[model samples]
Each structure stands twice: as C-alpha cells, then as structure tokens.
Target: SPGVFRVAVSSMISPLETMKGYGPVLSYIEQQTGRKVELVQRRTYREVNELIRENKIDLAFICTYSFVEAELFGARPVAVPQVEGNPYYQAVVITRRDSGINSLEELRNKRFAFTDPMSFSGHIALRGELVKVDRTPETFFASTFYTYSHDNSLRAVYDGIVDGATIDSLVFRSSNILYPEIGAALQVVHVSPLVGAPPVVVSPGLSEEDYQLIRRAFLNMHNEPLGKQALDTLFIDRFVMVNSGHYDYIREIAGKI
Candidate 1:
C-alpha cells in the first residue's frame, strides 16, 4: 500500500515506447526501495499533469510547461534528464519537404499543428516566437490543431495534412536517427532557444526519505547496470538534480504567449 509508487509519463516523447525505455529503471527503483513502481501513460500532457495534481500518481516525467502549470497543485522537480551531455533542449519548426513554406512568417494563414497545449517545446516555445513578431496563433494561423504528441506532429507534417508544425528538437532528432524514412520527408525551417529538459517530478505528499530515495536512484542510475541500460534506451547520459527555478524560462515564455 504505502510502498507502492505510481508514475505517469507525458506524451511529448515517443507515444508507444515511453514505458519500454524506462522499464529497467523502474524495476531498479522497485528493487532498491522495496516498493512497487507502477508506470502509467496518459494521452496528453494535460492529462498527466492532472493525474499528478489529483495525487493519482506519485511521480511523473512531465514537460516544462506542464510542470510550470502544475506547480500550483504541488508538483516538484526531483531529477532532470541529461541527453547528449546537455540538460537542455529546444523546439524545431518544420514543414513538408515540398511545402515551400520557408519561414515562420510564411505560415501565416496556413494550417499548423501543435504537439499539445501544455507542452513547453511543442506549444509555449513556438507561441512565444509568434509573440515576438506581434502575432498570436489564434489570429495568425488560418487553422491550428493539436497532435497530442511530438511523433504525431512529425507525421502530420510529413503527410501533407498540415502546412507546418513545431516539435520537440530531441524528439525530432531521435526520430530521424531511428527512422531515416521519416527524416527524409520533412525539413526544419527554424529552431527555438534552449530551455531546461523535461523533468521527473514527485507529488508533495512523498516522504522526505522516499523523495531522497527516488532522487538518488535517478542521480546515480548511470552507474548501475540496469539503470545504464534503461538510460541508454532513452538516450539519456544521466539524471541530474535541478532546482524548480530551472523551469522559470517556461514562465517567461508563457507570459509572452
């Protein structure tokens, strides 16, 4: 009962393989803490944030923007992923290879796809970019839709179903490396400035000892056999400690939007 820790992951990364990559890490946490670690998947960033707020899950790997929005409900960052030796990532604006949309300005009055409204790199970062040019998605784009995940947004852009889209740069790069066919179908037209990577956060109710245990498990995961295998599957070098303020850049972007 008390030893069970429930977790959920946002769909900002791979939709179907989120748990596949993290299974080994979860197993290791379970073994070390003598607790049952259960992983859950939500279809959208908002749903996972809501699950955290409702205390349905004990910890979650959530997007920066969702983490910012979920702060009022008591979510706190415990660990952040280091990918390619960097703890930061960005958004990439893309279009079909033959779309002829060369810039953000060209997408004006055109169909556009967003990963999810609560996504940092998917929604807020791109929205902030539009704000810089004195525009808003509602008024600038002819029609806009949410793909609910970065991979789906990439597919939408590749299928010619949407004129343009903004995706997590990490997701885009990983997709290219994993599926070169998907990479060959689109072109990047712009990239946003770097922001803190998505983080693993816990509910306020977790005990100090339990919090430390979970945090330590991630911080030292790269040194353990199963942890290393798990991190490698996710392309993470390690998990590092970070302050909640590390995500304040999201607040800055949200304000502009």
Candidate 2:
C-alpha cells in the first residue's frame, strides 16, 4: 500500500540505448499503483531470478527460459509484452552473409557467440540443438564465448568476431529496423520454434491485492494516454495477460537440455 515496489529487468533483453526506455513505463506503474517504483538490474539472469525467489524484489522481467529453468517456487507471470503483434518469440541463428555458413552444421568448428545461459533462444535452444546430435558447445565448436546479451551476440556475428550466434528473433528483427547497418551483413541461417516471450513475474510474497493491482496496471496501461506513451517509449505494443502454460515449450527444453 504505502511501500516501494521493486522491479528488476534482465539485461539480456536490451542493449545500451533501449534500456533507458523503461523509466517512463516505471513512472506509469508508480502512477497506477500509487507506490514508489524502484528499478533493479543484474549482470546475470540467475542473480535477478534469485531476487524473486528470495522475495527481495516484488517483480522481475526475466527470460522465458529462466522462468522454466529455475521454476521459482514463489513466482508467477503477470504479463508479457506483445511485439509487432504476437506474444511468442523465436531464436534466430545468424552468421555473416559472406561467411558461407548457411547452416548450424556448417558452423561446426567455427567460433560461436552465445547469450547468457538463461536465455531460451540465445543459449538453451541452441544447446538443445546440439544435444540432438550428441555434441555440446564445448565439443561442437572450435571456440565459444558468452556475450550475455542478444545484441552483443548479433554484433559479434556481424563483425566476424564470431562466425555465428543464436539470438532472440525479436532482437534480430528490431535491430534491422533500428540500425540497418548491423543487420545488412547478417544472414539468418535458422529459426527456432516459437516460444512464449519473456514475461513480467511477481513474487508469491506479494499480497494478492497488490498483485492484482499491479497486473491491472500493466494490462490497461495501453488504454490511457500516459500509459500509451509509456508503451510507445518501451517499444511494446501492449502488455497482455500471460500464464505459466504459455511457457510450456520453454519448460520442455529446460527439462531435457
């Protein structure tokens, strides 16, 4: 009621400039809930997820795969951002257009960049891909490095710093629009099956009343002028209702590989 609400965001989702856009949205949340809003960030998804598990944070924007990987006992999804139109996203495997690496197989023994391990498309999906062939990143690729963010992975592939990378399809799509130069030299060699987009999750320690109030704020944010402005700033069409079942595909991957 009269307390501060803390919201944490995983850095894997946004690059440099895009991250600052959250301020307006958090301001809108403060207005709607009548609570002071505090922003939190972590270098790793696992650290941010721990804030949720330990009840140190009221809400977190975590990777869809992180939700399945940790399966935090005291958390649930409140909403997911709709990008372009759908709430589902995919992993896009990319390599330099002239690298002649048209397939994951061709990238074998070539350097690769992976996002944080908690990323579904960035890390888990590709790892799962290797498992089917009885190879791991360590065994399949000559050298690999962790970039921690999809944009970093994309940049690495585009610059030939790495021969290939698996990154969020949304990042691939938007980067092409926001910075055409980066996407022009890249080729999409593969795309993973659609999975639920990352979601805004809340701690079970939050009272039901506070939870509903916060969820309603997100769901209806698009309907009001200020909320609409915040959504536009955030590059989200809107926040749509989502649930644990939305991430079933992610769960399957986490359980297996």
| Top candidate (TM-score) | 2
For residues 119-141, what per-residue lDDT tens digits would candidate 2 score against the true structure? 88888888877878899899999
Q: Encode model 1's per-residue lDDT on 1-257: one tens digit a residue.
A: 55687879864465567778778878887776887888888778878987888788888988888888877777877888888857457789999777889998899999999978888777788788777778889888998998887888888888888898998887888889987987997889888887777778998777788888888888999989988887888778899887767667678877766
- Quote each prediction's TM-score: 0.91, 0.93
Stretches > 4 Å off in candidate 2 = 12-19
TM-score of model 1 relative to the true fold?
0.91
Clashes of each: 0, 0
